[PDB]
C-alpha cells in the first residue's frame, strides 16, 4: 500500500507512488525499523536490470518504442548474452551518473541533480592514467573556488579481474596520526588511511592538517601513491566576523567535497571507482568535522575562548559554541570567494525539490535522519516533513575496503 | 555473528546486538521495500486470552515465580474469567508492573532512566465526570509538588463490553487555549484550536489571552463530556526571563511546569485504559525549540531574533540558530530560577545513553525511535545522535487512540 506522507508544519498531504519502482530490499521489516543504521548488514538478472536502465534512458529522451530503442535492447541482449557482461554508451553514462545523484536518499543537495559534469575515463588502463585523471576533475571542479558538480567514471568491475579502486574515502583527506598511547593528532576519522599511506612509502608530516596523498588501485596490482599538486587543493582559512581570537586557533577546511570509495551501479554495471564532488553545506564542516567528538572535537576549547560556563550542561556551552563555529565556516568560505551553502537555504531548495520530485516522478526517496542538519534540525523545513525511504537503481552504494 | 539486528555508536566504535526486538509480537509500518521510520502516526475472546497469558507470564517472570503454582493458578483464573465475561481484571500488583512497563517500552520516550519510580494511581473505581476530576486534580497536586515534580500516573476504568469510554477529551492536562482571529491567524496555541473551540461548544465562556489555561472536557461512560476549570493555584506557571537579556522579561512569555498527557491509550495484557493520564517533568527542547518556536506553534523566533538585532533577510547569519539558543537558555534559567523541575536536553540524552546500557545486560536491547530520541537542535552535540537503534513494538505499551469527537 503506497505510503500517505504528511507535511506538519504546512498540513500537506502527498501520496508516494514512486516507491513502488524499489527492485532492492532496505534493511527494515514489520517486526523492526532499522532506518537509523548507517551500513548495510547471473545472465537472466543482469538482463532485466540492463532493459529496465535502457527503457529509463530512452524514456527521459522521448524515444520509448522507438526504432533506436529496440535496437539497442537488442545490442544489450546479444552482448550479455555471448559474454556475460555488456558496455554503457557515453549518453547512456551520463545519464545514468545523474539519475543515481537524484536517487540517493540520504542527499540534500539534489536540487542540483541536472547540473553535473560527467568524465568518461573508461578508457583508463593504469595508476598513473587514474592520477591524471583525478587531477582534471580536481582542476574542473575547484575552478578557482567557483565550485561546479562533477564525477568522473572509471572502467566498470569485470568477472575477470580485480577491481579499479581509490583507497582514499575523499579525494581531499587529513591525515590522523595515532600516538604511542591511543589518541590521534589530526582527523581520527583518517587514521586507518594514513597508516595505509605510510606504509606505501609516504614520508609523513606531523600537523593537524595534513594533506593525505592517493593510493589509487589498478586490477590486480598493489595501489601505487600520488602526492595531490598544492596548487591542486583549495583551503579556506577559518577565521570569526567579530571574534578576533578565532583565527589564532589555526582552522582550515579544504574547498571541494570528492567522495572517493563508492560503487555506481547503472543497469546493473558496477563502477568501483567513480568519484564524484559538489561544494560544503555548512554544517558538515563546522558541526560534524570540527565538533564531533570522535573527529577534531574543538568544542570546547572554542566555549573555553567565549568564556562560557563548561562546568555544567544547561549553561548550553556547546549549543553557543556549536553556532559560532558554523558562523566562522560561513564568514571564511564567504569572505575566500568558495562556494558553499547554509543548512536553512540548503534545506528550503530539498523542499522545492521534493515538490518538483513529486510533479515529476510521483514521490522522492529520502533518509529523513541524514536530511535533516546536526544542528537545528526542528528550525527547518525537513524536520517537520515525513519521508519515505527506499532505493531505487541507478544507485550510489557502499562497497568494502580494498585492503 | 549473531542473527540479530547489529547497532553500532559511532562515536565510541562500539556495537551491541539487539535480542529484546525477538519478542515483539506487532508489526510497525516498515518493510524490506520501504522505511516508514519518519511517519508520525503510520496506520474478541482468543486473541484477548493470548495477550492475556503473554501479559501474565511477564509479570511472573518479573517476580521470578514463572512456572510456580501461583503462576498456573493466574493463568486458569484469567482464562476462567475471559471464558465467562469475555475480559478479564488485573490485580494491583500487576496494574502498577504494567504501567512502568509501557512506559518502559516507549520509544519515542527519552526520560525512560526514570521508568522504575513512576507513581501508580489506582482510579479503577471512578463512577462520574465529577470524580475523574477529583483525581485529576490530586494527580495534579501530588505530580506538581510544589515544583518538585514527580513522575504519576492515574488510571480509570477499562474499557468493558458494550459500556462507553472514560476519555479526557484534552490532550494534555494543561493547554493554552488558541482562538482562530477574524484576520485567519491565532491568538494563543495554534496546536489547540479544535479543543479550544468543543470547550466553548461545550459552554466555556472564552478569554482572549495568548496564555489562557483551558478547561477539561471529561467523559465518563455514555454521558456527554463535562466541563470543569482547574483551580488556579492547581496549575504551577514559570515566566520565563533571560540571565542576561533583561528585555527578555518584557515579551510576556510563560509555561506551565507539568506535562500531562491525557489522550494516549495504556494497553496491557490486551486490556485498554482508554483514559489513563501520566506526567513527568519536560525537557527543555520541549519547550523552548517545539512549542515557542515551531513555525505552527507560537512562531516568536524572528520576534526574538529582531529584539536581539539580528540579520533576519539572510539565512547565512544564522539568526535563527542564535535566537533559538537564548530562547532555550531561558527557558532552562526560569524554571532554574522558580525551582520546577526541568531537564536540559545535553542532560536527557546522557541518561538515555545510560538508560540504554541498562537495558541491554537487563532485556537484550531497547526500542527505540532515533527521530524523536534525537532532540531538535543541537543533534550531533549529544551522543544519542551517534548512536544507531532500533524501532520495534513492545506491550504493555501506551498506543495513540482517536479523538472522542
Ligand atoms: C551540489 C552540492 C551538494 C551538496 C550541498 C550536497 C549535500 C549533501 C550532504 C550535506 C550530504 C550528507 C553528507 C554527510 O553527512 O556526510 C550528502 C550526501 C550524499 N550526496 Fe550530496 N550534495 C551535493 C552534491 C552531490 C553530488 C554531485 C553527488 C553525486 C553526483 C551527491 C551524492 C550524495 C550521496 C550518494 C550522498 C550519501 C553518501 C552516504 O550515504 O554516505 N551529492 N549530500
Ligand atoms: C520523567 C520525565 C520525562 C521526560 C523528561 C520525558 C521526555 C520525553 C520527551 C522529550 C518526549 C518527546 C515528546 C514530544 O516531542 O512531543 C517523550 C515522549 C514520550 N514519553 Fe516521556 N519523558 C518523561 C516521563 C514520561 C512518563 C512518566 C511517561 C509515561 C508513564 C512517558 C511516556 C512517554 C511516551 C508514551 C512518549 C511518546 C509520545 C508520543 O508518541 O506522542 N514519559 N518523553
Ligand atoms: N557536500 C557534500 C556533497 C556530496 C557528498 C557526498 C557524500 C558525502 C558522505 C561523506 N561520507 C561520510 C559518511 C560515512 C558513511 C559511512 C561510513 C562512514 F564511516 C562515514 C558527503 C557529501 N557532502
Ligand atoms: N516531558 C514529557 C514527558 C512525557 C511526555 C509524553 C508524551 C509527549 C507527547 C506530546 N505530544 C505528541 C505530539 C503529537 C503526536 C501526534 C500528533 C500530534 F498532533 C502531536 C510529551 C512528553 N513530554
Ligand atoms: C546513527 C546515525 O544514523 C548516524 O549518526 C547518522 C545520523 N544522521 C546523519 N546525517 C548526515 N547527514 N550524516 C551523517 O553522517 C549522519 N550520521
Ligand atoms: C516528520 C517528523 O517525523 C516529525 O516532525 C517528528 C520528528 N521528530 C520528533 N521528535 C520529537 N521528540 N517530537 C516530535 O514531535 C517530532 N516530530
Ligand atoms: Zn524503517
Not at 520509448?64 to 535492447?73: I, K
Not at 578508457?123 to 574542473?140: G, L, V
Not at 564525477?151 to 582514499?168: E, K, S
Request: glycine fraction near 6%.
Amino acid at each position: 500500500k503506497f505510503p500517505r506522507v504528511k507535511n506538519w508544519e504546512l498540513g500537506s498531504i502527498t501520496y508516494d507512488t514512486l516507491c513502488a519502482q524499489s527492485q532492492q530490499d532496505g534493511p527494515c521489516t514489520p517486526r523492526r525499523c532499522l532506518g537509523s543504521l548507517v551500513l548495510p548488514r547471473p545472465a537472466e538478472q543482469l538482463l532485466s536490470q540492463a532493459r529496465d536502465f535502457i527503457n529509463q534512458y530512452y524514456s527521459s529522451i522521448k524515444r520509448s518504442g522507438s526504432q533506436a530503442h529496440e535496437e539497442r535492447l537488442q545490442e544489450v541482449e546479444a552482448e550479455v548474452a555471448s559474454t556475460g557482461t555488456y558496455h554503457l554508451r557515453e549518453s547512456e553514462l551520463v545519464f545514468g551518473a545523474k539519475q543515481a545523484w537524484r536517487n540517493a536518499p540520504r542527499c540534500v543537495g539534489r536540487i542540483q541533480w541536472g547540473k553535473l559534469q560527467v568524465f568518461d575515463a573508461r578508457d583508463c588502463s593504469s595508476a598513473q592514467e587514474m592520477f591524471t585523471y583525478i587531477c582534471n576533475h580536481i582542476k574542473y571542479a575547484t575552478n578557482r573556488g567557483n565550485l561546479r558538480s562533477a564525477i568522473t567514471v572509471f572502467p566498470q568491475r569485470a568477472p575477470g579481474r580485480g577491481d579499479f579502486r581509490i583507497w582514499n574515502s575523499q579525494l581531499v583527506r587529513y591525515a590522523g596520526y595515532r600516538q604511542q598511547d591511543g589518541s590521534v593528532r589530526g582527523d581520527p576519522a583518517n587514521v586507518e588511511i594514513t597508516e595505509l599511506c605510510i606504509q606505501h612509502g609516504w614520508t609523513p608530516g606531523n600537523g593537524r592538517f595534513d594533506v593525505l596523498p592517493l593510493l589509487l588501485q589498478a586490477p590486480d596490482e598493489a595501489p601505487e601513491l600520488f602526492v595531490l599538486p598544492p596548487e591542486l587543493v583549495l583551503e579556506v582559512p577559518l577565521e570569526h566576523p567579530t571574534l578576533e581570537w578565532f583565527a589564532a586557533l589555526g582552522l582550515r577546511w579544504y574547498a571541494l567535497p570528492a567522495v572517493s570509495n563508492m560503487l555506481l551501479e547503472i543497469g546493473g554495471l558496477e563502477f568501483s571507482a567513480a568519484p564524484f564532488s559538489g561544494w560544503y553545506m555548512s554544517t558538515e564542516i563546522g558541526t560534524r568535522n570540527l565538533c564531533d567528538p570522535h573527529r577534531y572535537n574543538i568544542l570546547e576549547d572554542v566555549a573555553v575562548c567565549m568564556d562560557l560556563d563548561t562546568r555544567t550542561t544547561s549553561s548550553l556551552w556547546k549549543d553557543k559554541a556549536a553556532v559560532e563555529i558554523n558562523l566562522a565556516v560561513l564568514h571564511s568560505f564567504q569572505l575566500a570567494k568558495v562556494t558553499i551553502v547554509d543548512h536553512h537555504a540548503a534545506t528550503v531548495s530539498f523542499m522545492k525539490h521534493l515538490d518538483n520530485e513529486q510533479k515529476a516522478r510521483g514521490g522522492c526517496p529520502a533518509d529523513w535522519a541524514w536530511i535533516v542538519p546536526p544542528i537545528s534540525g526542528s528550525l527547518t523545513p525537513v524536520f517537520h516533513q515525513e519521508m519515505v525511504n527506499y532505493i531505487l537503481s541507478p544507485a550510489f552504494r557502499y562497497q568494502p575496503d580494498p585492503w
